[PDB]
């Protein structure tokens, strides 16, 4: 299943967004959610990074808060604040959802893991269809 052990971070939630890509899109989403929540509202959680999916689970009950196919992840980024991570999913053909996280000490390891999953996945797909 998973490629690496789950990441203990805060899930800030998800919001619809207008476009599949852009650091401006994800920073707009982050500012909005941060302005409407406080740190005590944040959901401790871990992100399981598997070959084909990302799964977001509650901190140690490990209940499922979201599951996302790598093929429908259009974009990811670290926000202007180095703690923040977001990715955009194409929820449907014309529908985008931004999933957001607060990471300590920063978002480097999570973004790396998710980027690596996308790059592995793309080569696997080219290989399958060749």
């Amino acid at each position: 299943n998973e490629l690496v052990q789950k990441f203990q971070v805060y899930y800030l939630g998800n919001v619809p967004v207008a476009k599949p890509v852009g650091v401006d899109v994800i920073n707009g989403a982050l500012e909005s959610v941060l302005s409407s929540s406080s740190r005590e509202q944040w959901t401790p959680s871990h992100v399981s990074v598997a070959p084909a999916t990302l799964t977001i689970l509650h901190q140690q009950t490990e209940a499922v808060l979201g599951e996302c196919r790598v093929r429908f992840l259009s974009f990811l980024a670290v926000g202007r604040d180095v703690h923040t991570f977001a990715f955009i999913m194409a929820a449907g053909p014309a529908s985008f959802c931004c999933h957001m996280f607060w990471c300590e000490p920063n978002a480097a390891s999570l973004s790396e893991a998710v980027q690596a999953a996308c790059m592995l996945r793309y080569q696997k797909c080219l290989d399958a269809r060749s």
Binding site: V23, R71, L76, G79, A108, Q115, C118, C125
Partner: peptide
């Protein structure tokens, strides 16, 4: 100078990453 963690963070902050798996299936 800038460590490995650091250079990749600035990349992730400045451009993020567009998933080519998405575009691959999208172009179909």
């Amino acid at each position: 100078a800038v460590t490995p963690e650091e250079r990749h963070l600035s990349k992730m902050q400045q451009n993020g990453y567009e998933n080519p798996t998405y575009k691959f299936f999208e172009q179909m």
